[PDB]
A paper describes a structure:
A recently found family of pore-forming toxins, called CDC-like proteins (CDCLs), are wide-spread in gut microbes and are a prevalent means of antibacterial antagonism. Analysis of the CDCLs belonging to the phylum Bacteroidota revealed the presence of sets of two-component CDCLs, one long CDCL (CDCLL) with four domains and one short CDCL (CDCLS) lacking the fourth C-terminal domain, that act as a bicomponent complex via a mechanism only previously observed in the mammalian complement MAC. Unlike CDCs, the CDCLs require proteolytic activation with both components containing a proteolytically cleavable activation loop critical to the regulation of pore formation. Here, we present the crystal structure of a proteolytically activated CDCLL and cryo–electron microscopy (cryo-EM) structures of a prepore-like intermediate and the transmembrane pore.
(A) The cryo-EM map at 2.87-Å resolution of the membrane-inserted pore complex, from focused refinement with C30 symmetry, reveals a β barrel pore with an outer diameter of 260 Å, an inner diameter of 167 Å, and a height of 105 Å. We modeled 30 subunits of EaCDCLS into the map, allowing a complete visualization of the membrane pore complex. This revealed the complete unfurling of the α-HBs to form the membrane-inserted TMHs that make up the β barrel pore, which is primarily hydrophilic and neither strongly positively nor negatively charged in the interior. Each EaCDCLS contributes four β strands, at a tilt of ~20 Å to the membrane normal, to yield a β barrel pore composed of 120 β strands stabilized by an extensive network of hydrogen bonds. A major difference between our pore structure and the PLY pore structure is the smooth exterior of the EaCDCL pore, revealing full visualization of the β strands in the β barrel pore. Comparison of the various structures of EaCDCLS presented here reveals that the only change in height is due to unfurling of the α-HBs into the TMHs, while the D1 remains in the same position. However, we were unable to unambiguously visualize the EaCDCLL molecule, even after trialing various workflows incorporating symmetry expansion of particles, signal subtraction, focused refinement, 2D/3D classification, and 3D variability analysis of smaller wedges of the complex to extract the asymmetrical features provided by EaCDCLL.
Numbering used by the authors:
A (entry chain C), B (entry chain D), C (entry chain B): 98 to 197, 211 to 290, 302 to 374
Write the structure that this text describes.
């Protein structure tokens, strides 16, 4: 059970949207088309337009409200909300130098791997609890959707994601043999393999495209985007939903 | 099952278009010619014209709306949406130096290969869920197309694609023989093969045509187009569709 | 039993909110939708707007009040409230140099680990005890929620959190053998592993993203954010709640 759900359908992941719990669990996202009361939304970052109101919860309305809030006066993206980092570096080595009519066998093995995951939560837009205690305007739709598990998203997190994975393998198989008749034999085998997989969600495009240069771009893509600017608001990465019956926190498995 | 479908028919891949699920699965794209309510579209990038409305969903209307939105004020292509990178480098080696009336056999084998795939998602245009709960204007066309599996595209992703593949093979087959009668024999064979296949979708043309110079053009074509400009909006690369019955997310196999 | 509860649901963690004790204990946070009298809130930091009043306790109202209070005149973030630091450094070492037809065995083992936890409490917003002795406006809701364990949050702590953990392992397994017949044998094995996990809550984004450079960023992220500025108000990290029956301090297990 988790409180925050990773955004998988950006189109349907907007604040104030009502869905079925089962559909949200299996990534179907079947909406519940019923009227809803106007919702009050608040932003984690300090701004003049920190408390907005949306009559009809929709993706376009949420995007427009975020745009206006982050372009308003007294806006500061200087402080973020969360920053998780994790790196795992590993490096094996192997060397055999068997020697002995003559004979030699030199084997060298190398295996290097760096795996890095990073997430940053620039800010979140949160939804206020209804004054009437029910999100629905008619207040009878709650009884109408009995068995449909009405659950509405109440928080959307804007931030950046980044995953990198660099692997490398090296093999050396020198073999020498002499029978000084002057029979001679040599066998050299060098095998080199490399891999580098990157997955970035959001952030500055110029710094994002520089991660192709090994573990150097994925060292400035992070340090050049710590403060989120209104030109780079971030991407919805996580969201939280709550039950529509008792307004309790919805937990998914 | 996947949520995002790679664009194969750019003519028929426009937001607000209704097709049959089977036809979209087998790339037939048979349209459903029925009236539709005006659709609200939102853009992922920050701009003044971030929330547009289209009365008649069409490719020309979508293109014009994208053009106006990206030429509007307070537009920033500084932040992208996604960036996937993957590279695989491999290099074999083989060397035989058999020696022994005389005789020598020197065999050299080399095989190098670099495969790289990159995708960038500059932005997406998303469609709002209908207020009435049905995309059709008459609301009876939904029952009219029973058995036709009505599915409408609700999201179009603009970005760039790039695939490169460089292969190289080298062979050396020196053979010497002497019988010092002064019989002598020599056999030299050098075989070199090369291959380089590039496939780019979108991006700056000047940087795109420079990828012909090995793995150097496909190192600046990426780093010189991280920020998408209104002169280079990007190409529709992925799109998402939803069912017209329950407005649920459509998954294709 | 503890007096301060770590914030797990930022959406529901606002001052003046009434919840059930069991739901707050199991992180369900089921609200009690009943009218409440206007609440008086005070801020720990010195400011002109140090005593505010909120008619309807909500997250948006709390955020707006904090924004106005910290943007008011005579505001000083120079003095903080609490600062907890804890570091644990450990480093093992092992070295074997067994020697002996010949033979040698050199084994080297290293294991280093630094674990650091830091918390800073910039300020808190506290709630005054009701004049009537009951938070509810009607004064009968207290008897209405008998068995529901009415508990309301009365204090929210804004500050920063930081956890780092760096681990490293090194292994060396040199083995030599000679039988001077000139049989020779050598076996070298070097294994290096590294790990670095960081978790930051709040603080300056620019300093937060620099913690990726070992235990150097998590040495300036702390010293460059001691004084909290109105551009960096901090993040709600801890909160305290009290019973609604006798206005006593609520303790959770
Ligand atoms: Ca209502
Ligand atoms: Ca309709
Ligand atoms: Ca009272």
């Amino acid at each position: 059970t988790s409180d925050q759900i990773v955004v998988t359908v950006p189109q349907k992941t907007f604040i104030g949207g009502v869905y079925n719990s089962t559909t949200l669990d299996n990534l179907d996202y079947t909406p519940i088309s019923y009227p809803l009361d106007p919702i009050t939304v608040s932003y984690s970052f300090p701004s003049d337009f920190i408390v907005d109101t949306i009559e009809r919860p929709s993706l376009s309305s949420m995007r427009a409200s975020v745009f206006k809030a982050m372009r308003a006066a007294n806006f500061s993206g200087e402080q973020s909300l969360a920053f998780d980092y994790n790196i795992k570096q590993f490096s094996y080595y192997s060397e055999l130098k068997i020697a002995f009519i003559s004979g030699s066998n030199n084997k060298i093995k190398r295996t290097t791997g760096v795996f890095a995951k990073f997430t940053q939560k620039n800010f979140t837009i949160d939804m206020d609890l209804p004054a009437d205690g029910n999100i629905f305007k008619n207040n009878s739709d709650l009884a109408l959707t009995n068995g449909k598990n009405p659950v509405y998203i109440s928080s959307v997190t804007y931030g950046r994601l980044g995953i990198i994975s660099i692997e490398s393998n090296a093999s050396y198989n020198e073999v020498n043999f002499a029978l000084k008749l002057n029979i001679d034999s040599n066998s050299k085998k060098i095998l080199e393999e490399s891999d580098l997989s990157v997955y970035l969600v959001g952030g500055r495009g110029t710094d994002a495209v520089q991660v192709i240069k090994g573990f150097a771009g994925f060292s400035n893509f992070i340090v050049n985007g710590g403060q989120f600017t209104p030109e780079a608001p971030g991407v919805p990465i996580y969201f939280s939903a709550s039950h529509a019956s008792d307004n309790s926190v919805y937990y998914t498995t």
